Ligand binder design. Structure first.
Ligand SMILES: CCCCCCCCCCCCCCCCCC(=O)OC[C@H](COP(=O)([O-])OCC(O)COP(=O)([O-])OC[C@@H](COC(=O)CCCCCCCCCCCCCCCCC)OC(=O)CCCCCCCCCCCCCCCCC)OC(=O)CCCCCCCCCCCCCCCCC
Ligand SMILES: CCCCCCCCCCCCCCCCCC(=O)OC[C@H](COP(=O)([O-])OCC(O)COP(=O)([O-])OC[C@@H](COC(=O)CCCCCCCCCCCCCCCCC)OC(=O)CCCCCCCCCCCCCCCCC)OC(=O)CCCCCCCCCCCCCCCCC
Ligand SMILES: CCCCCCCCCCCCCCCCCC(=O)OC[C@H](COP(=O)([O-])OCC[N+](C)(C)C)OC(=O)CCCCCCCCCCCCCCCCC
Ligand SMILES: CCCCCCCCCCCCCCCCCC(=O)OC[C@H](COP(=O)([O-])OCC[N+](C)(C)C)OC(=O)CCCCCCCCCCCCCCCCC
Ligand SMILES: CCCCCCCCCCCCCCCCCC(=O)OC[C@H](COP(=O)(O)OCCN)OC(=O)CCCCCCCCCCCCCCCCC
Ligand SMILES: CCCCCCCCCCCCCCCCCC(=O)OC[C@H](COP(=O)(O)OCCN)OC(=O)CCCCCCCCCCCCCCCCC
Ligand SMILES: CCCCCCCCCCCCCCCCCC(=O)OC[C@H](COP(=O)(O)OCCN)OC(=O)CCCCCCCCCCCCCCCCC
Ligand SMILES: CCCCCCCCCCCCCCCCCC(=O)OC[C@H](COP(=O)(O)OCCN)OC(=O)CCCCCCCCCCCCCCCCC
Ligand SMILES: CCCCCCCCCCCCO[C@@H]1O[C@H](CO)[C@@H](O[C@H]2O[C@H](CO)[C@@H](O)[C@H](O)[C@H]2O)[C@H](O)[C@H]1O
Ligand SMILES: CCCCCCCCCCCCO[C@@H]1O[C@H](CO)[C@@H](O[C@H]2O[C@H](CO)[C@@H](O)[C@H](O)[C@H]2O)[C@H](O)[C@H]1O
Ligand code: SF4
Ligand code: SF4
Ligand code: SF4
Lengths: 145, 52, 318, 94, 176, 155, 52, 45, 115, 186
């Protein structure tokens, strides 16, 4: 009976997440208990998974780290936490993960990725990047008059 | 290249919302019919006019 | 002990109503190839709690043009009468055993219509008034057919007591000998509860929100709870009328389990129907009842007066 | 694709169609998200000779309108009457 | 060629007339509609688990702008102002002067991201691939001012996103 | 300790409010099409508790999804004022953000923030449906950070 | 519609406002693999019309 | 190298349906009414 | 006493929820907020203006038909009579006359709304 | 303030009326208690309320006016009213029934403490009762709004703007000229 096999698959998911505690963690953090193949992990702690039997769109996913750049992200996660090298693979712009097709290294590329900083003291504030256009006459500092 | 593809124009008989709804549904089917011919008859070559 | 019995009636009703809202959103979601709530609590189980708290800490508005007293009265009437509709329901024992329980439910349903009329009129705004007058049209459409449909069924049961329907259906569901009446009853309950494809007093795509368009926050929540309470109650009424459950006096919980399953499935069918059909035009609803159900209902009322007499199967008075 | 046999039968029966043959969710039949590089062709003007621009200059062939009448025999219509359409042979009536 | 969408006369034989009466009285066609929504209830939903799963995109996707560098670290932009000229929204503002080493470089490069229509004309017009639209689309802000990008912001975007941008350009430059 | 009690009550009202955001059924132009795709099955906004309701009396969020013209500006302000509080405004797309392609037109309001206060700006022309969803989840986190009861306690 | 938005995005980089058809032709040639995916979409679409 | 762009497969793509297909299901009108009356009579008895 | 208690509790509970709704939330009342709703534009004319009823004749017919059910509701009890010959004839007579009355209003175009 | 910052401009407004004031709105909100209590029936108190926009324009001119540095201004309205006449005008403009009754000072104070119990924003207080029944000082020696170029706005022209929302549906549309003004203490 398939209805018995379905229960085993769902019961297997509890062991695939390392017990009930790990299962409940992913259930409450990501609202999804599927088990996939660990494609890789980035230096911030994000873990990347695939299951190619899932339909297109659900076949790749990230479990975000619980802390990033000194911020607690156990409950507060956002798509901007995905670093650029994994961003391409997660959005299916490429087939190759950065574990296989590493990005080209440059001396100016950020070593540490930053998430969206709006609403924090690190937010961007616009300003004019050009210098003063008109130089004003400065009167002398002595009374000759 | 619409003169090179075969499709049917749906026509209503009562000029009401229901007939106009049927015409739009049948136009979707004909669009799929046209798309099929475009997929098979796509030619090679450049995609903008060779005139810089 | 009776005061405790009352609280063990209306608190569960309110909880069932809250979680019906989740179920409708999930059921509609999956029929629409999506999921519905699945974030707020696991599988969305906390979603109703967030909505209720949200509404009751939201600012209520009394419109400048509104009739203050009637504006406040109407939502109180809606919820208070929605709860009242439950007290005579045999599940299998009623909280209040009534001689004319069916006649009590008809009267309480008629009174509840005024919570739509007065809220719409008291709002003093055009979309609210249009919604209220649609309720006048809706009641005119279904009320006569609804009472006569009940009469025909009660000519097989013999009384207006709701517990007698349990006795009547001990051997066989009444849907067998009265499936034509069950069909017309089912549609009438959809019109009675202002449900799709008869959701005209609200008629979102047409009237924004119809009669309750000026209501916010807690007062709005009262109308919402009343509506979903009536959806469940009307489908419990249907289960008792046509799918009677067997009652073992020594194991009354077996009745309750069986009767609850039937009530849930009938409630699901309301959600199913809402996902499937377009909306009637409110004049077309009137013509449905008066030109189709009423002729058939009159004929079947004649048939069910004669059938017991000619078959010598008249039910007992007691 | 993971639906059990019973569920496949249930929705097949309810819909009245064999839904498994034309699923609306995409799986492995789609194109790979990495593709080999292209090698696009060039157009008809990519030549090293017999290619003077003046001989293929569409813009310079445009002319001002032809003045037919200004204020400085059989009757005609703008064009022949339109030919009557034919009924479709693929499916004349829906 | 044309076809009629609604031009058919129902058969008036006894079986057909009784088939239509059953449909009217027993609601057969309405029951059929219930079957369709029922079949959908038991289909896997199309929903993806955002932000843990993402909608697919291609290398051509036009997102947040960035200013790029050569492998040496020098800026690609040489202040030609082609992007500023072509911008359909006039969202680009540029000032330039000789750099302290004589290089032709900008002293202002602003993109008003609330003017911009994200059309990609600027990256088509650029002769050196200096200005691009990157793949980022998750940069909503809390204030309007945060979307008025100056050159420092755009260079940081390039440094932040270059690893992905260069791989995307590699995938699509033979189509350009 | 009152500080502890008000802190927990803040979490509850914040959680209830962000978990049940009901945007007003209100859209202006092409950005409203991407808003439809956020309600469509792939993203299913309703799964976050985000549900459109037509009446402003029953709405918590106004998503300004499209160009705001001078002729439309009074009606937008009207229906925003008729929203009970707390209420939030999400500006979606270049037109709503600052005028966009039509910034220099004689008939266009250069940003909806001249008419109403704005909590989140979603960039794009249009923002993708995912971009809009990112903006809604950003609004949720802004509501999560609110300190209404903690500030009242220290008044 | 969401699947057809992807076709827009794959040729132009935009889901809606492609700015792809221009005087002279189109902006860019179809990426490799696009016509197979359009064919896969079109194979099943008529069934979706049948359900509507 | 040779030209390489997106093209149809050599034989063309497989057939694509487009014509309306709403299959015919259900019992005859006679059979449905006969079952309905049969249930009525069993109920009455 | 049980019935009266049950009614009092139901409407007391509803009234309490309305009291909480009005005294719990933070209010911010001003003119534009409480103005009547008409899709963002000011209403033209009062909502108290007459609103023509196009089904006025069906509404009046409802009053007469609504009273027929009051005559018919006792039918389950009347079926307990020994005088079933009279009761059945009179029961059918009333329903038939209701059907005739419906047929008349139907044929004379009384169920069609005024245009 | 005058000691820490000798060059400060110090502005001394009377009770300020406006849409979001706690003045005209305060009187109009007494209607929920039926009658309107008043110390000595409001015949012993005089007020000279000033419009919010006048105070605003006076502040803005003080910033731009070099002569305003180090000065102290008094911003008062054009007219002085008896507290009884003012409240009577408020209820006339709002078309609410006006039932003034006398309440002695000690009684009014006791109720003031009653409303001070509220941990939120008290509807009234003992201190508030005192200030409402305090006579508005006459300070001829101080410069006023006219010294900064502002022309004081009469309460008769702006009361409807504040008090229209305090009416019922019956009286919402009543025009500005329908109510006769209040006796101004010449
Ligand atoms: C109140 C009612 C509820 C109370 C009774 C609860 C009974 C237990 C429910 C078990 C469900 C768990 C399913 C499971 O094993 O997870 C698999 C899943 C792994 O399997 P998978 O890889 O996703 O594959 C799924 C199938 O391939 C693809 O999915 P599928 O569509 O093929 O479904 C497989 C299976 C799943 O079904 C079940 O196992 C439960 C069946 C109970 C039916 C009750 C109605 O169903 C069947 O095989 C068919 C027989 C089931 C009856 C179908 C009859 C349909 C109604 C008839 C149509 C007309 C209606 C009128 O693991 C999980 O996700 C665990 C999630 C747990 C969710 C909570 C479950 C508890 C629900 C509430 C409990 C009560 C409180
Ligand atoms: C549980 C009760 C639920 C209703 C609660 C009503 C109070 C709602 C609070 C409220 O009115 O807002 C504040 C409202 C004051 O706000 P406002 O906007 O400044 O003035 C509202 C209008 O002036 C006056 O407001 P209005 O325009 O609505 O007219 C007042 C009243 C008119 O009242 C009268 O003219 C005399 C009293 C008539 C009621 C006595 C029975 C009349 C004959 C029926 C027999 C039933 C006996 C019970 O209207 C009614 O006819 C009241 C109907 C009550 C039906 C109760 C069902 C029994 O009421 C007061 O605080 C006074
Ligand atoms: C009446 C009391 C009702 C109790 C409601 C309990 C709320 C439960 C809850 O907050 O969900 C877990 C939430 C879930 O966290 P979250 O809402 O931030 O998660 C974001 C969404 N995911 C996880 C999918 C990325 O935990 C909390 O955030 C703490 C909130 C505390 C609420 C105050 C309790 C007192
Ligand atoms: C189906 C039934 C569901 C019912 C659910 C009922 C809600 C359950 C959750 C309760 C959470 C606590 C309520 C907090 C919400 C308060 C609204 C708010 O946010 O205001 C912010 C305000 C903030 O005020 P503020 O002083 O900081 O500034 C506001 C003024 N301006 C605009 C000028 C800045 O908080 C308060 O003022 C008081 C907070 C008190 C918290 C304790 C609540 C006591 C409630 C009793 C009120 C007394 C009247 C009786 C009401 C009935 C009593 C039940
Ligand atoms: C416009 C504002 C509207 C506001 C709405 C407010 C709510 C209104 C609620 C409806 C009012 C009418 C209620 C009538 C109850 C009738 C129910 C009934 O018929 O049964 C009650 C019971 C009779 O018992 P029964 O089974 O019929 O036979 C005797 C054997 N015990 O007998 C009893 O239980 C005792 C009943 C006596 C007291 C009835 C009081 C009703 C008076 C109206 C209130
Ligand atoms: C095509 C869709 C149409 C849409 C309309 C919606 C229709 C849905 C109707 C829902 C009701 C379905 C029937 C309920 C079945 C529940 C079965 C159950 O739980 O109880 C078992 C019951 C037999 O037990 P019982 O009812 O006590 O025997 C009768 C003697 N009185 O029953 C035995 O099976
Ligand atoms: C021994 C002799 C015995 C003598 C007695 C014999 C009696 C049996 C034979 C008589 C016929 C029995 C069936 C009667 C059922 C009622 C029929 C009916 O009124 O429906 C027809 C109605 C007509 O409307 P229309 O199709 O638009 O055109 C009419 C033109 N004037 O069309 C409609 O009403 C359509 C309704 C639209 C709303 C439907 C929305 C819900 C649809 C799903 C419901 C599924 C049924 C669920 C039933 C559950 C019951 C628990
Ligand atoms: C012997 C004689 C003894 C007589 C004792 C009675 C004396 C009455 C004292 C009058 C005190 C004046 C209180 C004024 C007032 O209550 O209004 C203010 C307040 C409304 O709030 P508000 O101040 O306008 O601004 C914040 C709005 N969120 O509050 C309100 O107005 C709201 C009132 C709601 C209705 C409750 C009654
Ligand atoms: C517009 C005006 C329309 C007027 C319509 C009037 C319709 C009347 C139709 C006849 C209905 C009654 O038909 C009649 O019913 C009674 C029972 O009630 C039957 O009576 C039979 O059974 C009863 C018991 O039930 C016995 O007491 C009686 O001795 C026996 O004859 C008659 O055998 C039958 O002839
Ligand atoms: C004793 C109870 C059982 C018996 C049933 C009692 C009710 C009988 C109702 C009979 C109605 C007959 O008279 C009715 O008049 C109108 C004329 O306006 C007829 O014709 C008109 O109405 C029908 C439906 O509205 C339309 O399809 C038709 O185009 C229109 O001309 C109806 O087809 C006819 O049914
Ligand atoms: S994408 Fe288009 S609108 Fe935006 S800066 Fe570039 S050229 Fe201007
Ligand atoms: S970004 Fe490119 S196009 Fe724009 S000024 Fe610099 S070099 Fe020129
Ligand atoms: S921002 Fe772009 S997509 Fe949105 S309304 Fe304006 S032009 Fe249309």
């Amino acid at each position: 009976m398939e209805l018995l096999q379905v229960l085993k698959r769902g019961l297997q998911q509890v062991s695939g997440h390392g017990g009930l505690r790990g299962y409940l963690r992913v259930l409450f953090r990501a609202n999804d208990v599927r088990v996939g193949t660990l494609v890789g992990e980035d230096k911030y702690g994000n873990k990347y998974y695939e299951d190619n039997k899932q339909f297109f769109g659900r076949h790749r996913w990230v479990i975000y780290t619980t802390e990033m750049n000194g911020k607690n992200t156990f409950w507060d996660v956002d798509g901007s936490m995905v670093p650029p090298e994994w961003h391409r693979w997660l959005h299916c712009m490429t087939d190759d993960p950065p574990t296989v097709k590493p990005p080209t290294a440059r001396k100016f590329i950020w070593t540490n990725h930053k998430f969206n900083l709006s609403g924090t003291p690190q937010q961007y504030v616009p300003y004019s990047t050009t210098r003063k256009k008109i130089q004003e006459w400065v009167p002398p500092s002595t009374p000759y008059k | 290249v619409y003169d090179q593809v075969e499709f049917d124009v749906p026509i209503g008989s009562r000029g009401d919302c229901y007939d106009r709804y049927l015409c739009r549904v049948e136009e979707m089917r004909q669009s799929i019919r046209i798309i099929s011919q475009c997929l098979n008859k796509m030619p090679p070559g450049e995609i903008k006019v060779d005139d810089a | 002990m009776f005061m405790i019995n009352i609280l063990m009636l209306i608190i569960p009703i309110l909880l069932a109503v809250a979680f019906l809202t989740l179920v409708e959103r999930k059921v509609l979601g999956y029929m629409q190839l999506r999921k519905g709530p699945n974030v707020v609590g696991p599988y969305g189980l906390l979603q109703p709690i967030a909505d209720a708290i949200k509404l009751f800490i939201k600012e209520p508005l009394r419109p400048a043009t509104s009739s203050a007293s009637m504006f406040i009265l109407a939502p109180i009437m809606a919820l208070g009468l929605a709860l009242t509709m439950w007290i005579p329901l045999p599940m299998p024992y009623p909280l209040i055993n009534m001689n004319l329980g069916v006649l009590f439910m008809l009267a309480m349903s008629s009174l509840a219509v005024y919570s739509i009329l007065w809220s719409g009129w008291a709002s003093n705004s055009k979309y609210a008034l249009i919604g209220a007058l649609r309720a006048v049209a809706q009641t005119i459409s279904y009320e006569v057919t609804l009472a006569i449909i009940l009469l025909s069924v009660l000519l097989m049961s013999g009384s207006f007591t709701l517990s007698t329907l349990i006795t009547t259906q001990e051997q066989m569901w009444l849907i067998l000998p009265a499936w034509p009446l069950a069909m017309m009853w089912f549609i009438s309950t959809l019109a009675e509860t202002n449900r799709a494809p008869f959701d005209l007093t609200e008629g979102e795509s047409e009237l924004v929100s119809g009669f309750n368009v000026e209501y916010a926050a807690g007062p709005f929540a009262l109308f919402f709870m009343a509506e979903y309470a009536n959806i469940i109650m009307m489908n419990i009424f249907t289960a008792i009328l046509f799918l009677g459950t067997s009652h073992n006096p020594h194991m009354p919980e077996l009745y309750t389990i069986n009767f609850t399953i039937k009530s849930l499935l009938l409630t699901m069918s309301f959600l199913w129907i809402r996902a499937s059909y377009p909306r009637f035009r409110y004049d077309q609803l009137m013509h449905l009842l008066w030109k189709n159900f009423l002729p058939l209902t009159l004929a079947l009322c004649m048939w069910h007066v004669s059938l017991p007499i000619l078959t010598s199967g008249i039910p007992p008075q007691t | 694709a993971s639906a059990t046999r019973f569920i496949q039968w249930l929705r097949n029966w309810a819909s009245g169609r064999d839904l498994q043959a034309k699923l609306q969710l995409r799986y492995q039949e789609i194109s790979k998200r990495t593709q080999p590089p292209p090698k696009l062709p060039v157009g008809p003007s990519h030549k090293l000779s017999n290619n003077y621009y003046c001989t293929r200059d569409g813009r310079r062939e445009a002319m001002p309108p032809s003045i037919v009448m200004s204020s400085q025999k059989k009757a005609v219509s703008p064009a022949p009457p339109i030919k009557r359409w034919e009924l479709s042979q693929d499916e004349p009536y829906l | 060629t044309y076809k009629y969408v609604n031009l058919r006369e129902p058969s008036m034989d006894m079986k057909s007339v009784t088939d239509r009466a059953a449909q009217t009285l027993l609601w057969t066609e309405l029951i059929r509609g219930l079957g369709m929504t029922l079949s959908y209830l038991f289909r896997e939903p199309a929903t993806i688990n955002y932000p843990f799963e993402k909608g697919p995109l291609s290398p051509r996707f036009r997102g947040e702008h960035a200013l790029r560098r050569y492998p040496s670290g020098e800026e690609r932009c040489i202040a030609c102002k082609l992007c500023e000229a072509v911008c359909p929204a006039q969202a680009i503002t540029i000032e330039a002067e000789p750099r302290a080493d004589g290089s032709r470089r900008t002293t202002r490069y602003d993109i008003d991201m609330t003017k911009c229509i994200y059309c990609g004309f600027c990256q088509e017009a650029c002769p050196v691939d200096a200005i691009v639209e990157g793949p980022n689309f998750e940069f909503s802000t809390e204030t309007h001012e945060e979307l008025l990008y100056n050159k420092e912001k755009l260079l940081n975007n390039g440094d932040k996103w270059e690893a992905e941008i260069a791989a995307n350009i590699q995938a699509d430059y033979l189509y350009r | 300790r009152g500080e502890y009690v008000v802190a927990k009550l803040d979490d509850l009202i914040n959680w209830a409010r962000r978990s049940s955001l009901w945007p007003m059924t209100f859209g202006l132009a092409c950005c409203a099409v991407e808003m439809m795709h956020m309600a469509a099955p792939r993203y299913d906004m309703d799964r976050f508790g985000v549900v459109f309701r037509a009446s402003p009396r029953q709405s918590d969020v106004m998503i300004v999804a499209g160009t705001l013209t001078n002729k439309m500006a009074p009606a937008l302000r009207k229906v925003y004022d008729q929203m009970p509080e707390p209420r939030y405004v999400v500006s979606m797309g270049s037109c709503a953000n600052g005028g966009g392609y039509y910034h220099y037109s004689y008939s266009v309001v250069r940003g909806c923030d001249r008419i109403v206060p704005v909590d989140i700006y979603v960039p794009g022309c249009p923002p993708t449906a995912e971009a809009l969803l990112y903006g809604i989840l950003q609004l949720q986190k802004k509501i999560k950070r609110e300190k209404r009861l903690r500030i009242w306690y220290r008044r | 519609r969401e699947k057809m938005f992807e076709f827009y995005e794959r040729v132009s980089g935009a889901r809606m406002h492609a700015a792809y058809v221009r005087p002279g032709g189109v902006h860019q040639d179809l990426p490799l693999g696009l016509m197979d995916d359009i064919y896969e979409f079109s194979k099943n679409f008529s069934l979706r019309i049948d359900e509507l | 190298s040779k030209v390489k762009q997106d093209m149809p497969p050599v034989g063309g793509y497989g057939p694509i349906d487009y014509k309306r297909n709403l299959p015919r299901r259900g019992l005859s009108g006679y059979s449905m009414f006969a079952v309905g009356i049969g249930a009525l009579l069993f109920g009455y008895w | 006493m049980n019935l009266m208690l049950a009614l009092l509790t139901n409407f007391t509970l509803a009234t309490l929820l309305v009291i909480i709704a009005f005294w719990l939330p933070q209010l911010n009342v001003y003119s534009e907020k409480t103005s009547p709703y008409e899709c963002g534009f000011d209403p033209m004319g009062s909502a108290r203006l007459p609103f023509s009823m196009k089904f006025f004749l069906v509404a009046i017919t409802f009053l007469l038909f609504d009273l027929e059910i009051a005559l018919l509701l006792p039918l389950p009890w009347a079926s307990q009579t020994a005088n079933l010959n009279t009761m059945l004839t009179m029961a059918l007579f009333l329903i038939i006359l209701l059907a005739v009355s419906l047929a008349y209003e139907w044929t004379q175009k009384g169920l069609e709304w005024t245009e | 303030v005058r000691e820490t910052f000798p060059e400060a401009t110090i502005i001394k407004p009377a009770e300020i009326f406006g849409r979001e004031d706690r003045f005209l709105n305060y009187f109009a909100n007494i209607r929920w208690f039926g009658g309107v209590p008043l110390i000595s029936l409001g015949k012993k108190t005089v007020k000279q309320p000033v419009y919010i926009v006048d105070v605003t324009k006076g502040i803005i001119n003080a910033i731009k006016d070099p002569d305003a540095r180090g000065k102290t201004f008094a911003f008062v309205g054009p007219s002085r009213y008896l507290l009884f006449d003012l409240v009577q005008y408020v209820f006339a403009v709002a078309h609410r029934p006006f039932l003034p009754y006398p309440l002695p000072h000690f009684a009014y104070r006791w109720i003031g403490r009653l409303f001070e119990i509220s941990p939120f924003e008290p509807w009234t207080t003992r201190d508030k009762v005192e200030r409402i029944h305090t006579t508005d000082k006459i300070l001829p020696h101080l410069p006023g709004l006219e010294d900064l170029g502002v022309e004081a706005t009469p309460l008769e022209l702006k009361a409807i703007e504040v008090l229209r929302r305090h009416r019922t549906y019956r009286w919402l549309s009543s025009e500005i000229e329908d109510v006769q003004p209040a006796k101004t203490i010449p």
